[PDB]
Amino acid sequence: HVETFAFQAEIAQLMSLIINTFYSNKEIFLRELISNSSDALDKIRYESLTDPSKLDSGKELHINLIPNKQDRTLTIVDTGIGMTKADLINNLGTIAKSGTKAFMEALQAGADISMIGQFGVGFYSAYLVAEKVTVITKHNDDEQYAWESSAGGSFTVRTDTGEPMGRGTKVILHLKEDQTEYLEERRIKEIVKKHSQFQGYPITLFVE
Amino acid sequence: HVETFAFQAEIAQLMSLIINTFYSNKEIFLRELISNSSDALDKIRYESLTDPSKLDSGKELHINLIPNKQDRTLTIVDTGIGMTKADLINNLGTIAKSGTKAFMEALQAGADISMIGQFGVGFYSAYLVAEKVTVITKHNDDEQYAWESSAGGSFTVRTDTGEPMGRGTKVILHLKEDQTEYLEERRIKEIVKKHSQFQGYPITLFVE
Ligand SMILES: CCn1cnc2c(N)ncnc21
Ligand SMILES: CCn1cnc2c(N)ncnc21
Numbered sequence A, B: 001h002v003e004t005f006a007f008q009a010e011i012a013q014l015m016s017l018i019i020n021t022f023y024s025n026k027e028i029f030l031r032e033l034i035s036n037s038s039d040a041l042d043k044i045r046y047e048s049l050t051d052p053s054k055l056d057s058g059k060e061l062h063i064n065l066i067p068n069k070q071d072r073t074l075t076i077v078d079t080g081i082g083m084t085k086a087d088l089i090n091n092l093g094t095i096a097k098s099g100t101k102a103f104m105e106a107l108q109a110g111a112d113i114s115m116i117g118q119f120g121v122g123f124y125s126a127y128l129v130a131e132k133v134t135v136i137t138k139h140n141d142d143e144q145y146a147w148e149s150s151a152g153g154s155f156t157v158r159t160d161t162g163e164p165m166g167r168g169t170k171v172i173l174h175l176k177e178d179q180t181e182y183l184e185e186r187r188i189k190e191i192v193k194k195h196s197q198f199q200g201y202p203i204t205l206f207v208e
Helices: A009-019 A028-048 A052-057 A085-107 A113-119 A122-128 A185-194 B009-019 B028-048 B052-057 B085-107 B113-119 B122-128 B185-194
Strands: A003-006 A063-068 A073-078 A130-138 A145-149 A154-159 A168-175 A203-205 B003-006 B063-068 B073-078 B130-138 B145-149 B154-159 B168-175 B203-205
Touching (some): A009 A085, A028 A052, A028 A063, A028 A113, A028 A122, A028 A168, A028 A185, A028 B085, A063 A185, A085 A113, A085 A154, A113 A122, B028 B073, B028 B113, B028 B122, B063 B185, B085 B113, B085 B145, B085 B154, B113 B122, B122 B168, B185 B203
Parallel strands (some): A063 A203, B063 B203
Antiparallel strands (some): A003 A154, A063 A073, A130 A168, B063 B073, B073 B168, B145 B154
16 A cells, blocks of 8 residues: 655755756756765675675666656666665654755855755755656565655655565656756766766666 | 784775875865764664664764874764774775775876765875874774774784773874874864865864
8 A cells, every 4th residue: 555654844845945946957966866876885785795695686786777758757776775664764864854954054055956965865856857756665674665756745655566676776757847858868978977977886878 | 912904905006195196185184084974973873763772882973073282193083883893804995996996097087186085985085194093993793993004005903902982983193293283273173164064963173
């Protein structure tokens, strides 16, 4: 079945600022989520150094970028450590609150939105370009789940019925109608080469 | 007793470049290590969300900066997750190698040293200002250890005899003789306010 939850009020308010506030360097959402995938991979790798059996769910450590003009979605796939039910419901929220509140301070007090990842809340930069975000995720210790929000204050969590992925995370961006440039091959290569490309696992772009 | 180990050749070569290569924005070492402390704290906090008993070794989550003109040392203390014997010997090394090799690519191919933390190897920026670095560390699952290097290719690891700290990490910088400006109160406040001060735990400076 499906459970509906409210965002914490500060995450709710950050999400409203991102959605509305007119801002035209929206391409940063992609380095932020590639960066989140990098971290996830570092974590399952690190864990696998004292327990090779954590990799039983997959040896491959990579990030895939999969545009789809027909569904109008850009998907970021990584084979990182994934996320548990408590992560999606309570735990990531709690860790996010301070980063959030602080970021909202830096926003109304000078600084620009490109600095979201410096406060550990880059994930929400998805809402620059996406109307709905769907996250399919699987951690060694837990079931596969789907998390979904279109913002406006709430989110859903159901255990995921569909195709098993073994371990990792798949962020599905349902792109706003004026944001389709991010489904184009060379738009994508340009950003990926531009920003993120220090770290550090293979980033493969799937051509349609 | 004391065990002596060789650095991996790429860490050895990064450490030589940092030590020698004349470079005059050396104040970045401090945001890099404050940033490492921030991460450590995020990790023990995150872990404590599904197991409050991880905090049995200390509820306080903070970073202390302790200059000492007499011993000529600047110490960074955090009550983060700390580091185990395998972390100091094998595990952090392994995770560092790619970041390292890549950073050395960016160094001889344009980019400047301020970008060390972007490759997850900021810790080594200590050697801009320190001749010897001593690290006292304690993880819930392991004994207290001391790690020490003056570079030139090797490092030591002994189980730490002295004053128990409960949990966390204490980075002791034995400052080079021309680097004593980093023992001054307002030098320290200036850098700490300048760079790092988005995230996100209390940073307390101890006055002598
Ligand atoms: C910070 C939480 N978080 C955000 N993105 C991810 C991810 N792709 N994999 C695992 N955890 C994540
Ligand atoms: C990346 C490894 N690492 C570097 N610094 C620390 C630290 N203070 N506490 C825990 N781990 C650390």
